[PDB]
């Protein structure tokens, strides 16, 4: 068919920035295995006609066939970390930043990628080094090289030596420096070799907050298995790409909404336990083999998010309009006005009423047609 | 208080500095011992 696109959030035990830079520069002296924590798969649209709610559900459920092994032949994967992109304007600000890109076409590469995505084994640096895409990988680290070069050379450029042949133009120094600098592998490798500390410090500021321990993830997105999988995947990856009406909500709201997505259960032979959170191996194996990461359970969360948000807003808006209209045209004293304000607001949003409303919007099936 | 009895002592003074025409409270004690 067509290359399937994949976005992979990746992590490693150690210093992720140093290992990534060593991988990029080909200085195979600090590379380490990479663990894939979360991912999402999609196919290019190719058709403007917006499919109905029951068409995209089926199309998406056809991807995660029955074992988390995506259906396809050739794959295009983008490995990324935490951080916020700069220079872009939208409704909200981003939460992740791409790091590099690889293409898997051969049989061996496809088998390795499927094994990594199904069970959870780490990927050795050999495959990543061999399958890297140079033209697209280095289109990202293009302006940073120029900025770092200018900052390093920013020692006073007098450009007035004159003499016999040293009388280069005021603007000629920067022009020549730009011309002689290659915005590719060579420039980055030389800068790393000669100015390692400054380069590392500069890179650690564009990817703020990219080095966290497993307990941080467990505390933020856990402690439940269903939450730990679904909420992580939606909040970090799909929310910005899909860009619906739920892209301006914070993490607490998303967890609250997920609490109502009640679907059948099936206990596992065993769970994860403490004293193993010193590495990403146990958490990765636990997450990749879950039953919420494939099938019809993972193909129908975003639709429920949209439906629930719309259902809540529908009633909230009408109640607010009624209250405001009544408030704006009442002629009474202060005591009566305060009494009315608090009485109306209590009558609308008392605890039992909220409990009933919440019990009225609970689903027991991922299929939109059988909700 | 909740199902109890409250007994208080009050005074009214006729001096110019205190007030007069006004009632003042001195202390409050509980009287619920002999239920």
């Amino acid at each position: 068919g067509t290359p399937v696109e994949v976005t992979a959030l990746y992590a490693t035990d150690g210093c992720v920035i140093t290992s990534s830079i060593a991988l990029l520069t080909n200085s195979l002296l600090g590379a380490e295995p990479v663990y894939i924590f979360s991912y999402d798969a999609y196919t290019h649209d190719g058709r403007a006609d917006g499919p109905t709610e029951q068409d995209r559900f089926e199309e998406s459920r056809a991807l995660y066939q029955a074992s988390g092994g995506l259906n396809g032949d050739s794959f295009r994967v983008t490995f990324c970390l935490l951080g916020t992109e700069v220079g872009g304007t939208h409704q909200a600000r981003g939460r992740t930043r791409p790091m590099f890109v690889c293409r898997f076409e051969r049989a061996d590469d496809v088998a390795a990628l499927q094994d990594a995505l199904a069970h959870g084994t780490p990927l050795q640096p050999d495959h990543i080094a061999a399958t890297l895409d140079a033209e697209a990988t280095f289109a990202l680290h293009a302006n940073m090289i120029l900025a770092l070069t200018v900052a390093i050379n920013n020692a006073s450029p007098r450009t007035g030596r004159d003499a016999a042949a040293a009388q280069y133009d005021q603007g000629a120094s920067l022009r020549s420096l730009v011309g002689r600098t290659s915005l590719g592998q060579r420039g980055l490798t030389t800068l790393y070799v000669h100015h390692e500390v400054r380069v590392l410090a500069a890179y650690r500021r564009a990817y703020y907050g990219s080095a966290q321990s497993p307990f941080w993830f467990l505390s933020k997105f856990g402690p439940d298995e269903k939450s730990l999988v679904l909420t992580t995947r939606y909040y970090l990856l799909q929310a910005q790409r899909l860009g619906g009406a739920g892209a301006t909500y914070d993490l607490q709201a998303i967890k609250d909404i997920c609490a109502t997505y009640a679907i059948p259960h099936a206990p596992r032979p065993d769970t994860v336990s403490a004293a193993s959170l010193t590495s990403f191996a146990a958490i990765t194996r636990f997450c990749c083999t879950s039953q919420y990461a494939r099938g019809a359970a993972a193909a129908g969360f975003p639709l429920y998010v949209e439906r629930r948000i719309a259902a809540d807003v529908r009633e909230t808006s009408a109640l607010e309009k009624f209250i405001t209209h009544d408030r704006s045209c009442l002629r009474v004293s202060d005591r009566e006005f305060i009494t009315y304000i608090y009485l109306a607001h209590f009558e609308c949003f008392s605890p039992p009423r909220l409990a009933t409303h919440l019990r009225a919007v609970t689903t027991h099936d991922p299929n939109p047609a059988a909700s | 208080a909740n199902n109890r009895l409250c007994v208080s002592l009050c005074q009214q003074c006729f001096a110019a500095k205190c007030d007069s025409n006004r009632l003042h409270t001195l202390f409050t004690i509980d009287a619920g011992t002999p239920c």
Binding site: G87, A202, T248, D250, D256 | -
Partner: protein, 550 residues
């Protein structure tokens, strides 16, 4: 549970976000942006009598509410969605805000508002308000109010302007942003592609060059003359570096969070000759914004106001009704008077140190607190119940003889006594305001020649095994102890202790923990010395520990 306690507070914050985002994107005209010549003109003045009339644009958004109503979730969502700068009016407020924000998802360090616009140590001892000013305009325009505010705060403003203009390499223009723009123009790239990466490569640039949305928390304790200064400072900085946002013609947006009822600000002054301290009340920022007519018309406060009601903690009826009556200024009836009669008790009951143990006493003076503390310390000795001891420690102050001579010469009045001057200046030499509530003894002073100094020495009394608080930023050194066995195991199991420290001494923390663990062995047999412990289980433990060690 915890799902229906956030239902109504998470659907009502969207309009606030929409309005703030709309406000923070409007563009100014080309004939309104302050130029860099205005500050050069100001820096070359001697008295505030030569200031002309000028305007500095800005915009505001108010968030007022009762204490305990839940206005923090708004800041949480704003930080998570928008790009802003979060500050605080004091140190406690900043620490609480950082705790919340970092406990939710993620955050950077949080500082005060004084550190943001360049407040130094010396400015703490300036004289505020010496030159007369009289409003001239019938309902004064914005320029009149701005000039009055700049005249009130003259010393700090002038010093900051001089320092900022001189420190920028004299007349050498800063090259942090200009070189990148020149290179981008030469190479023919998209606008803003290379300049916006300046903060990443330079790690000392101020935060006011990064965003134009400023959040001020607990703004009720700030004086009204600080609404202008901040604004002023912003423009100046952005005119010096020529930042990317200065070229797009944007203006600051100030989001002020507070409560206008249970908060006030005070101003004090010192009068020489008689050596007297005078304190009074003034206006704060929220009242300035709400009450003034010109500001109300300029900032359009009707479309930029959100109000939080409700209280989450009250579970009583009459108490809530009384609180509402007191807050909203309703008339007082006899039912409230009858209700409030349950809490009264004689004063001698309260002032006895043997009644109501562990309760806090609120007075209205610095002398009653001292008297009660002395009474309590005297009582804790003779009528001892154990596990409470009282001891004393010395404190001291050094003076300057030459500087005292100079001050006396400048102020005249040759006849002066060190004791009287020190007694008069008791409220200003110290660092914190609780120095007057301490139980201290008789004063004593001496003169040490050779070094030509005068030293005053005194004693202060403290209790043992009592809870205290640190009113300052002091460095501390950890040197042992971890509690009971279970607590020690729990602390060692999790790595949060490592993460709390900065990302520079992880190896140091590991080494310290390793040393403590190494010294933590032995003494197990002292535990085994418990009477009536065992006979053979001791040998079983011996064998087990030997096998484990092998």
């Amino acid at each position: 549970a915890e799902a229906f306690l956030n239902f109504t507070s998470m659907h009502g914050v969207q309009p606030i976000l929409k309005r703030i985002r709309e406000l923070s994107q409007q563009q100014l005209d080309g004939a309104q942006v302050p130029h860099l010549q205005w500050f050069r003109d100001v820096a070359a003045l001697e008295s505030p009598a030569g200031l002309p009339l000028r305007e500095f644009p800005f915009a505001v958004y108010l968030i007022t509410g009762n204490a305990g109503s839940g206005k923090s979730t708004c800041v949480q969502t704003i930080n998570e969605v928008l790009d802003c700068v979060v500050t605080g009016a004091t140190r406690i407020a900043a620490q609480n805000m950082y705790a919340k924000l970092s406990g939710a998802f993620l955050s950077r360090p949080i500082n005060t508002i004084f550190h943001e616009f360049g407040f130094r140590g010396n400015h703490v001892q300036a004289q505020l308000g010496q030159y007369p000013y009289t409003l001239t305009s019938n309902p004064a325009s914005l320029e009149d109010l701005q000039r009055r505010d700049l005249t009130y705060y003259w010393e700090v403003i002038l010093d900051l302007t001089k320092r900022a203009l001189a420190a920028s390499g004299g007349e050498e223009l800063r090259n942090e942003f200009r070189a990148l723009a020149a290179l981008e123009r030469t190479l023919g790239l998209a606008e803003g592609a290379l300049t916006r990466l300046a903060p990443a490569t330079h790690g000392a640039l101020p935060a006011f060059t990064r965003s134009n949305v400023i959040v001020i928390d607990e703004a009720g304790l700030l004086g009204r003359h600080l609404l202008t200064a901040v604004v002023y400072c912003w423009w100046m900085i952005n005119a010096l570096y020529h930042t990317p946002q200065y070229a797009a013609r944007l203006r600051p947006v100030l989001v002020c969070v507070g409560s206008p009822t249970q908060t006030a600000s005070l101003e004090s002054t010192f009068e020489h000759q008689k050596l007297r301290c005078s304190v009074r009340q003034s206006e704060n920022v929220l009242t300035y914004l709400i009450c003034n007519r010109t500001l109300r018309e300029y900032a359009r406060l009707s479309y930029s106001w959100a109000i939080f009601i409700n209280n989450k903690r009250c579970v009583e009826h009459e108490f809530g009704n009384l609180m509402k009556v007191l807050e909203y200024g309703l008339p007082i009836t006899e039912e409230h008077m009858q209700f409030v009669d349950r809490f009264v008790v004689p004063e001698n009951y309260i002032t006895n140190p043997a009644n109501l143990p562990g309760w806090t006493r609120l007075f209205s003076s610095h002398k009653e607190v001292s008297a009660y503390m002395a009474k309590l310390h005297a009582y804790l000795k003779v009528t001892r119940e154990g596990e409470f001891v009282v001891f004393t420690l010395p404190v001291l102050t050094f003076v300057s003889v030459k500087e005292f001579d100079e001050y006396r010469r400048l102020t005249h009045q040759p006849g002066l006594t060190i004791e009287k001057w020190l007694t008069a200046n008791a409220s200003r030499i110290t660092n914190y305001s609780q120095s007057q509530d301490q139980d201290a003894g008789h004063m004593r002073c001496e003169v040490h020649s050779k070094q030509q100094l005068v030293v005053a020495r005194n004693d202060v009394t403290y209790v043992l095994n009592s809870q205290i608080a640190v009113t300052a930023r002091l460095r501390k050194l950890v040197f042992g102890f971890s509690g009971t066995f279970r607590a020690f195991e729990a602390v060692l199991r999790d790595d949060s202790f490592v993460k709390t420290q900065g990302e520079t001494s992880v190896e140091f923390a590991y080494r310290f923990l390793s040393r403590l663990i190494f010294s933590g062995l032995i003494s197990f047999y002292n535990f085994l010395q418990r009477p009536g412990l065992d006979a053979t289980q001791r040998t079983l433990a011996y064998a087990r520990m030997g096998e484990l060690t092998a």
